[PDB]
Amino acid sequence: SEKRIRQTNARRLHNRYYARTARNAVKAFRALTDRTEAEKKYPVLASMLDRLAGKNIIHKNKAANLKSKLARRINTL
Amino acid sequence: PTIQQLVRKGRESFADKSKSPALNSCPQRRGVCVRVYTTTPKKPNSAMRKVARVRLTNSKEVNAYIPGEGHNLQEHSIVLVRGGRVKDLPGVRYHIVRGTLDTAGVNGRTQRRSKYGAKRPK
Amino acid sequence: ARYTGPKSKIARKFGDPIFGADKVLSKKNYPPGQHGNNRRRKTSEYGLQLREKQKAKYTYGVLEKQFRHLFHRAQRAKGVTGELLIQFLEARLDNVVFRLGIAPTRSAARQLVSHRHITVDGSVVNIPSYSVKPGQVIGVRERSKSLEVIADALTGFNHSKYPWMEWDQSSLSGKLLHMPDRTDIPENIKEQLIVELYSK
Amino acid sequence: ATKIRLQRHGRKGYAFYKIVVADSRAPRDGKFIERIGSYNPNTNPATIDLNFERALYWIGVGAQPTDTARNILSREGVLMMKHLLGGVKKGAFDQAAAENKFEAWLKGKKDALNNMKA
RNA sequence: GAGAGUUUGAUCCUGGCUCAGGAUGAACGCUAGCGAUAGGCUUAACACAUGCAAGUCGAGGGGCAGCAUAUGGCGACCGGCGCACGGGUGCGUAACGCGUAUGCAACUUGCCUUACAGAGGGGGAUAACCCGCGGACUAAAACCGCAUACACUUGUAUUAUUGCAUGAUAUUACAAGGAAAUAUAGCUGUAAGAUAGGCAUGCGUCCCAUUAGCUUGUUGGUGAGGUAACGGCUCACAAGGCGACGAUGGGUAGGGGAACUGAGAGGUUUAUCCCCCACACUGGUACUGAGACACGGACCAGACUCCUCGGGAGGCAGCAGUGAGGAAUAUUGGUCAAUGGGCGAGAGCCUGAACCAGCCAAGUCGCGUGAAGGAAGACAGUCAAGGAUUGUAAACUUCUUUUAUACGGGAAUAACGGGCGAACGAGUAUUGCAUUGAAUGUACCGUAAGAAACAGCAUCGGCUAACUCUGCCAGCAGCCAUACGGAGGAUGCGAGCGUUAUCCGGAUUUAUUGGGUUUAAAGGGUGCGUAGGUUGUUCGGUAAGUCAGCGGUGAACCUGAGCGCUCAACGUUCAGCCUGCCGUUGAAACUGC
Numbered sequence A: 001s002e003k004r005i006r007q008t009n010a011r012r013l014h015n016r017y018y019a020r021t022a023r024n025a026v027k028a029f030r031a032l033t034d035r036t037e038a039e040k041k042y043p044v045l046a047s048m049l050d051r052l053a054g055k056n057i058i059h060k061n062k063a064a065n066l067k068s069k070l071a072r073r074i075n076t077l
Numbered sequence B: 001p002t003i004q005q006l007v008r009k010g011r012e013s014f015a016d017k018s019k020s021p022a023l024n025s026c027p028q029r030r031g032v033c034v035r036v037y038t039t040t041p042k043k044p045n046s047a048m049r050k051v052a053r054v055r056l057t058n059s060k061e062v063n064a065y066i067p068g069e070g071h072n073l074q075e076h077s078i079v080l081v082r083g084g085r086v087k088d089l090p091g092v093r094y095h096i097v098r099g100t101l102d103t104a105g106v107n108g109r110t111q112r113r114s115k116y117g118a119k120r121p122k
Numbered sequence C: 001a002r003y004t005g006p007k008s009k010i011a012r013k014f015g016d017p018i019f020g021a022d023k024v025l026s027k028k029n030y031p032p033g034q035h036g037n038n039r040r041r042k043t044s045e046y047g048l049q050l051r052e053k054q055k056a057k058y059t060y061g062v063l064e065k066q067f068r069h070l071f072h073r074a075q076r077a078k079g080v081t082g083e084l085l086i087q088f089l090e091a092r093l094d095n096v097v098f099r100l101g102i103a104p105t106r107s108a109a110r111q112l113v114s115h116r117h118i119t120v121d122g123s124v125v126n127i128p129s130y131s132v133k134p135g136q137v138i139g140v141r142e143r144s145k146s147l148e149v150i151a152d153a154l155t156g157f158n159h160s161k162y163p164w165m166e167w168d169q170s171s172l173s174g175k176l177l178h179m180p181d182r183t184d185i186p187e188n189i190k191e192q193l194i195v196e197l198y199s200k
Numbered sequence D: 001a002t003k004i005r006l007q008r009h010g011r012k013g014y015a016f017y018k019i020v021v022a023d024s025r026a027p028r029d030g031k032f033i034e035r036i037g038s039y040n041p042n043t044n045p046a047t048i049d050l051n052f053e054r055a056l057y058w059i060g061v062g063a064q065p066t067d068t069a070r071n072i073l074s075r076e077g078v079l080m081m082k083h084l085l086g087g088v089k090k091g092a093f094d095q096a097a098a099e100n101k102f103e104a105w106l107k108g109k110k111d112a113l114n115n116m117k118a
Numbered sequence E: 001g002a003g004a005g006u007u008u009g010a011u012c013c014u015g016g017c018u019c020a021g022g023a024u025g026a027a028c029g030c031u032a033g034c035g036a037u038a039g040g041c042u043u044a045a046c047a048c049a050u051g052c053a054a055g056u057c058g059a060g061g062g063g064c065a066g067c068a069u070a071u072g073g074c075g076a077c078c079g080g081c082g083c084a085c086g087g088g089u090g091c092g093u094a095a096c097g098c099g100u101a102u103g104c105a106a107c108u109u110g111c112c113u114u115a116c117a118g119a120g121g122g123g124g125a126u127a128a129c130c131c132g133c134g135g136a137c138u139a140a141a142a143c144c145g146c147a148u149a150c151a152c153u154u155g156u157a158u159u160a161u162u163g164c165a166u167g168a169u170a171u172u173a174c175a176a177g178g179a180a181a182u183a184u185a186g187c188u189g190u191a192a193g194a195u196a197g198g199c200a201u202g203c204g205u206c207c208c209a210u211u212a213g214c215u216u217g218u219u220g221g222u223g224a225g226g227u228a229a230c231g232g233c234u235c236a237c238a239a240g241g242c243g244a245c246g247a248u249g250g251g252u253a254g255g256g257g258a259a260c261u262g263a264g265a266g267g268u269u270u271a272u273c274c275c276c277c278a279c280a281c282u283g284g285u286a287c288u289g290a291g292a293c294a295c296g297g298a299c300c301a302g303a304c305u306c307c308u309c310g311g312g313a314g315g316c317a318g319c320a321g322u323g324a325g326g327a328a329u330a331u332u333g334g335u336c337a338a339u340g341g342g343c344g345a346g347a348g349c350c351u352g353a354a355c356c357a358g359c360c361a362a363g364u365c366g367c368g369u370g371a372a373g374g375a376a377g378a379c380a381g382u383c384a385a386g387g388a389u390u391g392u393a394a395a396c397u398u399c400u401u402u403u404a405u406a407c408g409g410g411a412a413u414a415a416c417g418g419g420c421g422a423a424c425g426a427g428u429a430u431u432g433c434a435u436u437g438a439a440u441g442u443a444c445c446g447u448a449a450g451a452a453a454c455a456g457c458a459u460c461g462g463c464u465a466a467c468u469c470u471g472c473c474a475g476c477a478g479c480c481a482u483a484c485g486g487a488g489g490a491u492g493c494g495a496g497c498g499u500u501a502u503c504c505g506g507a508u509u510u511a512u513u514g515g516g517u518u519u520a521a522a523g524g525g526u527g528c529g530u531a532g533g534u535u536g537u538u539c540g541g542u543a544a545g546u547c548a549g550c551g552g553u554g555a556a557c558c559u560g561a562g563c564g565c566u567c568a569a570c571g572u573u574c575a576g577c578c579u580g581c582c583g584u585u586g587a588a589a590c591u592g593c
């Protein structure tokens, strides 16, 4: 019975770390102004979101929504 | 009424009422006799009927008629009460089931034994 | 359950010796009890219908639930209700044995059927209420073809005159041709009274 | 996954099975997607009724049969690769001729003589 | 598709009532043989002790305590999958919850099937082990990078087709970004299929107006965020929205198919069975996961309870005990042999699902308790003779069913291990496998032997006289004796028979089908008038009502025909019902516009 508790707790910490990292990266990217700098840091954050969706921490549709929003912003500066 | 009147209002149906409401749809009930007394019938009938005031388990007071020749019922006796009303007696709409719990069968019976809880003679 | 009571009482109550021929029906033609042969109080039409139903039941050895189910079957079936009811009553296995003459009385036929001395289509059938269909073969079981009672009952029954029954003494068996008509059935039961009693 | 299995539907002491296509999570005698046959194991010839076209379709789309359902399908001849042949055509298996194999095996009948001479 | 009685001195009406009939998850009284097949806490989402109910994989990994000299295997640990199903309950809920019919160009979907591609390199932890709760070491198909996917996601452009507005689809791309597992069967990406969910709609869905106004994210818009997904779902202008076609509030209830009942219309209930929903001591919050109201998970707050002085546990609406409550409902049983389910390459393991057995007048069906002869014994009743009575006693056959013995199926068919056409799937041949189970069935001993009660008997109503006598009886007429009690007889039924409770029909006693209002209950004191209901005649359109055709949709039970249960209940197959809803084509007499 403790095996389920331990596995659930370890997985909860593991998921929380990566989800929080991705959320902070998205929040930091949303505040950028320089178009060249935003275009330079967009690929790494897109990679982070797609890797999260692959690891199943978030949904592929959620990653797609976030990437679409950030690409639209980078288009409009 | 007109069809428009019936469309507007409609018809009403009223559910009937139980002839023995203190049973609460149970076929029988358990009770305790408060007072075991004797009563007089209506005008065209003359006798001394044996009735008991019974407190049912559902906290209801009933008047139950004790049938058969003679009984051993007293106060604080646990009895079984079933439905059935006597015509001449007013307000007595229940019967005591003989041969169950405290009340015993009618002694000396040979016919209609199952109605008075009398065992088959040897 | 079975009636298994005295038979001359029922015979005298109904007048007709429905259980065969007896020496008691003469010099005694009154219903049983101390109140017999004291004239005849007017019995109602309902009483007459009831007495006809009881006559049929005591004749064929059938209790009330089975009789009611037989009436339901006749009502469902196509034809005259009363004629169908009498045909269904006569199509019972014990009645078929009795008409074939293997046993002297209907109760004797029922006892033989119950004790498994009767075969239907080569197989032992021991339900006395079994409904025999035309074209079937009902015969004595091979292990009991030399029973003294069966031999005595068949002695003198060389007639086998029933049109709807074909008897073969070589095989000790018989077959049913068709369902006989009510007029051909030799029973004094007025099925119309039973029909109205059960339908009203 | 989608499955081919039997629902027990007879009575006590006499089992009759309904060959259905059902989701595996469904109750044994409960919800089913489709009914494709019936199975009576009480008769010695082991009576089987089956819808060949529908059974083949469900096998094609990937329903997984239970052990007894797979045996029934094999006996009826659904389990075949004649349609799987990519290098041949009109490959009449004709195995129904051998699968007939009518087992008309009966039992001899004996009788006991009634020597009641008394 | 049929009943009866009852207001009077008598009659015809009106009107209620009481009895007849059918049914039950019933209970109670008397009595009780069997077989088959159903059912079994209806009262509280009451309380307790013990045990079981969900595990499996050593073809994933480090290992090795129980054995052969890590190899058989395997306690524990890491890891994969499952426990969200099966099973239980009906609290809550009047709601797109449920039924029926659709939509998603606003959606998600583990395991299973198919097709196209790919499986290249590397790193760090920490369980167990070891040394003491703390520390040290280490492996993986655990976890995480880098490389490659242009089949996927995102952004832009081009071309073409097209829909129902937002738009959808298909070639062309350039750009960025995203995977994998190995062991003796597998893994990753994408697409399609199948399955399973989600959301939104038309219509239908209980009483109270002694409930008439309700609403401020509330109605719409712009934008943003968020979600699998559209959306006031959330967050930063306008004043709208819902309402006598019943809003709001209050009360009550899980909803359907069944089932029962009636000629039908309809009515009653959802016990067992199936589908959907809700829930798991009471609330709140999430986490894990393809999937969560998390039914044998966690945290917190409550209350209750238990065991211990630092504290720790439980939740009985999973299966069996017990207690309590009640008129009332069973074993702390056997087996995984069959069907289903989980895991495993398979063999296999587990399974209180299930299949069985036990208990219970026990609902239904079937059978027995003997068969054929035998004169008017004894004893009971009535009047010398009726009746019980061919009844008994005698004598002769049978053994269904009990008893004892023996043979004894079917429910079990694939397995696993050998082959054979060949490149993996199948197709054949074999071993072993039955809880029930001395149960079906079969056969032989010798035996009428082991097996009938209950309610009526004055009329309705089928059944009669004696002895007793307020005691009583009672559905009614009523009776203190053709009615009370006993005796003898007779009449119903029959392993049952009566009583009570509940529901339905006759009952047209809510009357659309199908009732009434001078005097039996019932015309408002009379008008005007709002909503609503109804609308002279004729011509021409329309097609809402109406009519017709075509198509889709709608387990079990119930209806003709079979088949199997020795018959029957029952089981099963097939023909006849679909007589509602939805979509799409026509017609124009009538109603509507």
Ligand SMILES: [K+]
Pocket: E289
């Ligand atoms: K999972």
Ligand SMILES: [K+]
Pocket: E336
């Ligand atoms: K099993």
Ligand SMILES: [K+]
Pocket: none
């Ligand atoms: K008009």
Ligand SMILES: [Mg+2]
Pocket: none
């Ligand atoms: Mg990568």
Ligand SMILES: [Mg+2]
Pocket: E289
């Ligand atoms: Mg999750």
Ligand SMILES: [Mg+2]
Pocket: C001
């Ligand atoms: Mg019976």
Ligand SMILES: [Mg+2]
Pocket: none
């Ligand atoms: Mg008046």
Ligand SMILES: [Mg+2]
Pocket: none
């Ligand atoms: Mg007036």
